[PDB]
Design a protein around this ligand. Structure first.
Ligand SMILES: [Ca+2]
Ligand SMILES: [Ca+2]
Lengths: 115, 115, 115, 115
């Protein structure tokens, strides 16, 4: 599992469950091509987005649908989504965990990169 | 001044100075069109991006060039940039401050919306 | 004004208004003695805590009463308070801003130290 | 394992390894009594601090020795430590994960509380 996403809810102190995540990869013509998508589990984690073979070098965009998360809980949030854009695998394959911490008017995102 | 951007550096404990910031507004055909841009000042702030007349309701993207900031300091960063995407909504007088707190492998962003 | 405190509310996207803040200085016997205190203003800021003459080198604790803030908003919080503990060091002219970003189950704090 | 601590390094995008953590519990005379201590592993996690039987109701302080962490990496940080203070088990036993995200001049802490 070379790409994992973990999302927490800073209002409830809980995993953010059922958060939709869409991953895109920049194509040779500079457009964002759809790459993988999924939703966070009861643990706030999303595994199985991609494989070592498919997850080649490139610029990737991880779009976390924070607005739909808050709206489903009856909350009108500020952001449309949280976007995380990064070059991956430039020095060979790595494992990436993209974490996000959500509040209605704020979020944080951190990358943990391991070899 | 209905839209301000403030950027802080969590490694040096300082304003993030001379950071390029580009603002886009979502067009009818779902493309991002340039709206305003600048570089943060010595206080990490970018004022005068738009005016009340120009800053109508819609979806805006604030792209902060974090990668160039870290590279100018000789520090290896994770993200290509930090993106903040939000809907501006008219509900009484509103001023939007988009704050960002930068680390090489993490950032947070918060919206301070006041009257 | 060598020491300022700024507090933001990540749930409402606003300054955190009327938050009690207590500053302590570490005494010779390793106890915390009261040094300054106040409540944040309508802009979430607390100025005028100390003076250059009084704010000598040493270890300081800034205790932010986050629990009372959330309870006044009818929101259930995790922490008893947020504590920020740091050494003030004289290396040229220095101004310290202690910023805090509050959510019910999470907070961040950053030091902005400028000349 | 009713109390776990996880620490990440926002400069390196890595677990924060070998971070000392000291836990205290407020005694009946209002002093902070030592409760448990440990260090984070190669994964940035600290397990085994306490047991369900020992981890009774109370006010707990989790002190994360961030300064020694940064100093051992050759970095002079701002904070002495990161303190996390909370009432535990008030509505019956819960499992607490205290996460911290470290930068030299900033940190965040979040609590994930599960039943
Ligand atoms: Ca390459
Ligand atoms: Ca009880």
């Amino acid at each position: 599992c070379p790409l994992m996403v973990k999302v927490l809810d800073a209002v409830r102190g809980s995993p953010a469950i059922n958060v939709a995540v869409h991953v895109f990869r920049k194509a040779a013509d500079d457009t964002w091509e759809p790459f993988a998508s999924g939703k966070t589990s009861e643990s706030g984690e999303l595994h199985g987005l991609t494989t070592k073979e498919e997850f080649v070098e490139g610029i990737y965009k991880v779009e976390i649908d924070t607005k739909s998360y808050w709206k489903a809980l009856g909350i009108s949030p500020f952001h449309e989504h949280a976007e995380v854009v990064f070059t991956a695998n430039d020095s060979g394959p790595r494992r990436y965990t993209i974490a996000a911490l959500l509040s209605p008017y704020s979020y944080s995102t951190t990358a943990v990169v391991t070899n």
